[PDB]
């Protein structure tokens, strides 16, 4: 196995995947690494198994159809993985915890959102459809863009949204277009 966490790339107290070489800190993995389970397969392995069990699940889909899906186990899992993929980029540190807003010439968003709040919402099964999770994810970056205006710090929002959107199209097998 790897000697660093796959998500945050740091050493420490790591839990090792039994079906691939990846390793994780307890609360870096989503869901948090399970108490027992021998052997244990990580989220990457579990997502791979879904695809292998239903090869056709990789044929192209319409975003509109994906967003209306109910958060049954497999969609719950895919959303956990997509969130994990955002946390894997170091730039996610800017969006992880609860933000605050006091900048001259700007007003805070009406509905603040951050990655840890989405993490909790997923953990407590608060979303009934994929749409709920994707809306909150996109809100994080949209709140950022609006608040930071012409400061070049706005680009952090663009960069992390691009990671989200690429991984969304990949995980949910969205039909490729120009």
Q: Where are the alpha helices (DSSP H) in the chain?
A: 43-53, 63-68, 73-87, 93-96, 115-123, 130-148, 154-171
Minimum gap (Å) between residue 123 Cβ and Zn ion? 17
Minimum gap (Å) between residue 151 Cβ and Zn ion? 30
State which residue, 106 or 123, has the beta carbon closest to Zn ion: 123
Q: If binding means CB under 5 A, how many residues of this protein chain bind Zn ion?
A: 12
Tokens of 19: 């079906």
Tell me the HSE value of 78 on the side-chain side, using a 13 A CA sphere. Answer: 25
State which residue, 50 or 139, has the beta carbon closest to Zn ion: 50
Asked if residue 82 binds Zn ion (CB under 5 A), the reply is: no
For residues 56-78, one letter each, b for 16 or more C-beta atoms within 10 angstroms of the residue's C-beta and e for the rest, the string is eeeeeeeeeebeebebeeebbbb
Minimum gap (Å) between residue 32 Cβ and Zn ion? 12
Minimum gap (Å) between residue 143 Cβ and Zn ion? 25
Q: Contact 94/154 with Cβ under 8 angstroms?
A: no
Tokens of 92: 């996610």
State which residue, 27 or 155, has the beta carbon closest to Zn ion: 27
User: What backbone phi and psi angles, to 5 degrees, belong to 111?
Assistant: -135, 90
Contacts with Zn ion, 3-32, as mask; x by CB under 5 A: --x-xx--------x-xx----x--x----
Minimum gap (Å) between residue 40 Cβ and Zn ion? 8
Contacts with Zn ion, 28-57, as mask; x by CB under 5 A: x-------------x-xx--------x---
Tell me the HSE value of 60 on the side-chain side, using a 13 A CA sphere. Answer: 4
Q: Which residues form the interface with Zn ion (CB under 5 A)?
A: 5, 7-8, 17, 19-20, 25, 28, 42, 44-45, 54
């Amino acid at each position: 196995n790897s000697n660093i966490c796959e998500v945050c790339n740091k050493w420490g107290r790591l839990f090792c995947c039994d079906t691939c070489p990846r390793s994780f800190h307890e609360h870096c993995h989503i869901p948090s690494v399970e108490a027992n389970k021998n052997p244990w397969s990580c989220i990457f392995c579990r997502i791979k198994t879904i695809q292998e069990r239903c090869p056709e699940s990789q044929s192209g889909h319409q975003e509109s159809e994906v967003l209306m899906r109910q958060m049954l186990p497999e969609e719950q899992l895919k959303c956990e993985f997509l969130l994990l993929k955002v946390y894997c980029d170091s730039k996610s540190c800017f969006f992880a915890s609860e933000p605050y807003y006091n900048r001259e010439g700007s007003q805070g968003p009406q509905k603040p959102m951050w990655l840890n709040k989405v993490k909790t919402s997923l953990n407590e099964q608060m979303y009934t459809r994929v749409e709920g999770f994707v809306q909150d994810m996109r809100l994080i970056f949209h709140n950022h863009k609006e608040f930071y205006r012409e400061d070049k710090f706005t680009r952090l929002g663009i960069q992390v949204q691009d990671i989200f959107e690429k991984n969304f199209r990949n995980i949910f097998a969205i039909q490729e277009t120009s």
